[PDB]
């Protein structure tokens, strides 16, 4: 199991969501965040942090590469600021209503 | 050390908090998020993302199973949408005020 | 690659940002959160969760100790509530605009 955390442009949420759902994703969490990247000592009057959305998608390992490709293709515009993806390990997943775990708590297959 | 990330119904925060504190938890972070799960191509007029709270609780490994059980018991209602828990590894924890690490930065025992 | 998650006092954002940028950091994400720590059964009228900012900084492993030290030095005040840092593994990083990975998606060196 892995967590895919994708930081995207806010306007891209629905395009990314549709891509993910059509690829078989059946869960995801979205956070409002602000950030900076490489910015191709500070100011008291201006703000370097830009609004983004943080998508968190917990998947099985066999899904990761597909998910990444779907996100990148849907989120990209070609302009600096398109976002960044971080993949990290997940040890266990539990569905609260039922107590089901791992693939049972993630998968479209029940 | 592990991070327990629990996505719960907003109204359940205080019931879950009380359960955790009574089980000996002495730290946690809460985020406002939106999400979807299995939803037992999109719309321009309606919103599939539902408001939830993201609880992040960093614990020692011996605490994990207890914490999960306390969260599930307090958060559950039986209706779809009760939430989901993800456990992930933590390599190091540091308390900023003192520089203490790991168990010293987590534990109720000082 | 590691994720450094630093929970800090809101007023400290710019001091911490400046320290990180001067140490060579060229990316970070900030979240509004609420939390509690050790609090040196609840109430219906009062709120134990305190506003904090969650900084997420994905770095290469050689940067971690420097980053931690910069954060702690900039964020500390000496009063309870100064914050907490969690370090966790990252398996892969992808820049959305270009598809670059790992160090190429993190580093100041291109
Ligand atoms: N190393 C990082 N750690 C944590 N968050 C980051 C990091 N780099 C970028 N981010 C997040 O991703 C968002 C988008 O970054 P952005 O797309 O500008 O990256 P970039 O490296 O500057 O690439 P580009 O050249 O395409 O702009 C940032 O606003 C921030 O929220
Ligand atoms: N795989 C996932 N990855 C990331 N976040 C998820 C995932 N699945 C669910 N979530 C988060 O958990 C919240 C609650 O999900 P929910 O309880 O509806 O899960 P479910 O799998 O549909 O189970 P149920 O049948 O009990 O509804 C979602 O709104 C989202 O924030
Ligand atoms: N174990 C934990 N898991 C998750 N978040 C935590 C944990 N401990 C603290 N936090 C987060 O860090 C914030 C700051 O905690 P705080 O600095 O009060 O920690 P503390 O352990 O009480 O240390 P101090 O004695 O310096 O107050 C909390 O409000 C919460 O957001
Ligand atoms: Mg950029
Ligand atoms: Mg559901
Ligand atoms: Mg405290």
- Tell me the backbone φ, ψ of residue A43, rounded to 5 degrees: -120, 150
Q: How many angstroms from the chain centroid is the CA of residue A2?
A: 11
Record the resolution, in angstroms.
Answer: 1.0
Cα A85 from Cα C95, distance rounded (Å): 6
Three-state SS letters, chain C: CEEEEEEECHHHHHHHHHHHHHCCCCCEEEEEEEEECCCCCCCCCCCCCEEEEEEEEEECHHHHHHHHHHHHHHHCCCCCCCEEEEEEECCEEEECCCCCECHHHHCCCC
CATH code for the domain in which residue C63 is found: 3.30.70.120
Is the distance from CB of C68 to CB of C8 less than 8 angstroms?
no
- Pocket (CB within 6 angstroms of ligand 1): A 7, 33, 35-38, 50, 52, 80-84; C 27-29, 56-58, 95, 97, 106
Any idea of the CA torsion for B75, B78, B81, B84, to the nearest 10 degrees? 50
Ligand 3: residue of B3, B6, B27, B92 to mutate (most ligand atoms within 8 A of CB) is: B27
Tell me which residue range forms the domain holding C56: 1-110
Q: Contacts from C10-18 at CB under 8 Å and sequence distance 24+? A: C10/C51, C10/C52, C10/C53, C12/C53, C12/C74, C12/C75, C12/C83, C13/C53, C13/C55, C14/A42, C15/C74, C15/C75, C16/C55, C16/C70, C16/C71, C16/C74, C16/C75, C17/A42, C17/A48, C18/A41, C18/A42, C18/C74
Number of domains chain B contains: 1
Taking alpha carbons only, the member of A5, A1, B91, A6 closest to residue C89 is: B91
Q: String of b and e for B61-98 (b: at least 16 CB within 10 Å)?
A: eebbeebbebbbebbbeeeebbbbbbbbebebbbbbbe
Q: Phi and psi dihedrals of A106, rounded to 5?
A: -115, -45
Experimental method, per PDB record:
X-ray
Judge whether C79 is closer than 8 Å to chain B, CB to CB: yes
**Ligand 2 proximity of A35 Cβ (cutoff 6 Å):** no
């Amino acid at each position: 199991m892995k967590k895919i955390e994708a930081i995207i442009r806010p306007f891209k949420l629905d395009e990314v969501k549709i891509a993910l759902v059509n690829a078989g994703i059946v869960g995801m969490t979205v956070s409002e965040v602000r950030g900076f990247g490489r910015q191709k000592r500070g100011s008291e009057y201006t703000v370097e942090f830009l609004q983004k959305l943080k998508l968190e998608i917990v998947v099985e390992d066999a899904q990761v590469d597909t998910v990444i490709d779907k996100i990148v293709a849907a989120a990209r515009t070609g302009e600096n600021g398109d976002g960044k993806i971080f993949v990290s390990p997940v040890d266990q997943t539990i569905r609260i209503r039922t107590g089901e775990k791992n693939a049972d708590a993630i998968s479209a297959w029940s």
